[PDB]
Curated annotation (Swiss-Prot), chain A:
It comes from Homo sapiens. Its main location: nucleus. InterPro entries: INTS15. This is Integrator complex subunit 15. GO terms for cellular component: chromosome; INTAC complex; integrator complex; nucleus. GO terms for biological process: brain development; eye development; mRNA splicing, via spliceosome; RNA polymerase II transcription initiation surveillance. It comes from the Eukaryota. The keyword Nucleus applies. Component of the Integrator complex, composed of core subunits INTS1, INTS2, INTS3, INTS4, INTS5, INTS6, INTS7, INTS8, INTS9/RC74, INTS10, INTS11/CPSF3L, INTS12, INTS13, INTS14 and INTS15. The core complex associates with protein phosphatase 2A subunits PPP2CA and PPP2R1A, to form the Integrator-PP2A (INTAC) complex. INTS15 is part of the tail subcomplex, composed of INTS10, INTS13, INTS14 and INTS15.
Curated annotation (Swiss-Prot), chain B:
It comes from Homo sapiens. This is Integrator complex subunit 10. Component of the Integrator complex, composed of core subunits INTS1, INTS2, INTS3, INTS4, INTS5, INTS6, INTS7, INTS8, INTS9/RC74, INTS10, INTS11/CPSF3L, INTS12, INTS13, INTS14 and INTS15. The core complex associates with protein phosphatase 2A subunits PPP2CA and PPP2R1A, to form the Integrator-PP2A (INTAC) complex. INTS10 is part of the tail subcomplex, composed of INTS10, INTS13, INTS14 and INTS15. The keyword Phosphoprotein applies. Component of the integrator complex, a multiprotein complex that terminates RNA polymerase II (Pol II) transcription in the promoter-proximal region of genes. Belongs to the Integrator subunit 10 family. The chain holds residues 1 to 142 of 710 of the full protein. It is found in: Nucleus. The keyword Ubl conjugation applies.
Length: 367, 142
């Protein structure tokens, strides 16, 4: 009834919102076996500090009452002990509902997820990872980039906390790797990975093949989702990032970032273990179906992006870097062909090499 | 079809990769596939470049399996002789201990066959007898 809503439409730290959420979750759990948009939208708007009326004042702003409500929600979610209920609540909270505070609601949901990760709410973190899997790559990747920018830029320890969570949660680690690859698209200066985030990623490359395998084995994959439902294998991003070592200097004075080549190369070297693990998981086992691995015909887009982005004085200043990047790309293509990740035959990338700088690695890739 | 040249280029790349991080050299060495069984001596040299316990264990597995696959390289015989001598004496070398651990990690039949091959190669009476005695001590059933 609307009387309960009115009784829950007062104060920004009110426990009535938590009681309403618990009752709705219990109703959903009771009816799940025999299985509303409006109630979830209203609950999110109440959390987002936007009132029930579409054009009324904000629901009591934020202040310390919003922090109290967030703490109460985190405490309830950690002790919720219901994967489906937590996943449904997380999906409802961070979905674009068209309200005036939709982006702020998504940002607050990401903030709560970061708080849960800091609180080591492992079941809640897993539910958030599943919700991100059930969310568009654009909004989820933007939220991940915002959370990474918030944490990594602070004092040391946030990278340590992220690495510890990645060691604990492998699905969250794979989602974070995919989100980092999507953010570090080599598109601009901001696309250059930050030092702390890159250090955490490089340090967390001991179980990256294991995390990728865990993400692959977590759930069978359907057809291509809408713009990517958190694809596990972000191999193209890592391969480009290794290639984009001189791109840090190219995008920028000019020589602002040039020492990251070795760390990226070390992180890229983990793909050999990932390639062998993927080969064992697909070719050796019965998982040799579909396209081998997550390719999505992105190899041609990757080659086109490499050709387009490398135009910044490739001839003499970055000749050695271009040749090394060509060798890395050839190694990635050979790994994909041997491991079966790229089911397509030749000329899919050999023709693309025509619009790339000539190197001995190009002949080696052709050979 | 320019296969020796590719091996030479890979050797030069590995030589240039010694100063840099070993992960990059390992990644470059892993994805070769063109003539890896023929260039397995280069892979053995790369595995012997690293001297960690895990690296030595992986070397003692992979290189031994390749040598069983390709029993015609004198480098395999040299490694087997070094492992046998390491078992006999000179325990002060950690790499010798790693080679001895790799030799003992193999099955008894494989170790007996390797010792028999070394003894057959050991034309000297003393060396052949000592190798046979060590094989009998390690493997009483041989």
């Amino acid at each position: 009834m609307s009387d309960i809503r009115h009784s829950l439409l007062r104060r920004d730290a009110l426990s009535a919102a938590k009681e309403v959420l618990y009752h709705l979750d219990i109703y959903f759990s009771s009816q799940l076996q025999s299985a509303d948009k409006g109630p979830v939208e209203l609950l999110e708007e109440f959390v987002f500090q936007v009132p029930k009326e579409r054009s009324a004042q904000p629901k009591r702003l934020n202040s310390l009452q919003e922090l109290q409500l967030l703490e109460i929600m985190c405490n309830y979610f950690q002790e919720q002990t219901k994967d489906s209920v937590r996943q449904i609540i997380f999906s409802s909270l961070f979905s674009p509902q068209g309200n005036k505070a939709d982006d702020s609601r998504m940002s607050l949901l990401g903030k709560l997820v970061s708080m849960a990760v800091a609180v080591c709410r492992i079941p809640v973190l897993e539910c958030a990872a599943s919700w991100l899997q059930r969310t568009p790559v654009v909004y989820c990747v933007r939220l991940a980039k915002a959370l990474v920018d918030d944490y990594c830029c602070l004092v040391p320890g946030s990278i340590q906390t992220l690495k510890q969570i990645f060691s604990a949660s492998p699905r969250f680690c794979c989602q974070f790797i995919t989100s980092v690859t999507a953010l570090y698209d080599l598109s601009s200066d901001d696309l250059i990975p930050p030092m702390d985030l890159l250090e955490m990623i490089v340090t967390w490359i001991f179980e990256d093949p294991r995390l990728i395998l865990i993400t692959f084995l977590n759930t069978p994959i359907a057809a291509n989702l809408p713009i990517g439902f958190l694809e596990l294998t972000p191999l193209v991003g890592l391969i480009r990032w290794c290639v984009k070592a001189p791109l840090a200097y190219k995008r920028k004075g000019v020589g602002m970032d040039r020492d990251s080549h070795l760390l990226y190369s070390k992180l890229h070297l983990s793909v050999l273990q990932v390639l062998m693990t993927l080969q064992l998981h697909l070719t050796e086992k019965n998982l040799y179906g579909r396209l081998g691995l997550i390719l999505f015909d992105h190899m041609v887009p990757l080659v086109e992006e490499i050709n387009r982005l490398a135009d910044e004085l490739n001839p003499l200043n970055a000749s050695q870097e271009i040749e090394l990047s060509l060798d890395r790309l050839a190694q990635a293509l050979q790994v994909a062909m041997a491991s079966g990740a790229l089911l397509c035959t030749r000329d899919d990338l050999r023709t693309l090499c025509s619009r790339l700088p000539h190197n001995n690695l190009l002949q080696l890739v052709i050979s | 079809m320019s296969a020796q040249g590719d091996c030479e280029f890979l050797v030069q790349r590995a030589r240039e990769l010694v100063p840099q991080d070993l992960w990059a050299a390992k990644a470059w060495l892993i994805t070769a596939r063109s003539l890896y069984p023929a260039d397995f001596n280069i892979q053995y040299e790369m595995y012997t470049i690293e001297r960690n316990a895990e690296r030595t264990a992986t070397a003692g597995r992979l290189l031994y399996d390749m040598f069983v696959n390709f029993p015609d390289q004198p480098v395999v015989w040299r490694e087997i002789s070094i492992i046998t001598s390491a078992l006999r004496n000179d325990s002060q070398d950690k790499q010798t201990q790693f080679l001895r651990s790799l030799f003992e990690t193999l099955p008894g039949r494989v170790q007996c066959e390797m010792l028999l091959k070394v003894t057959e190669q050991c034309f000297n009476t003393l060396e052949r007898s000592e190798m046979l005695l060590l094989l009998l001590r390690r493997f009483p059933e041989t």
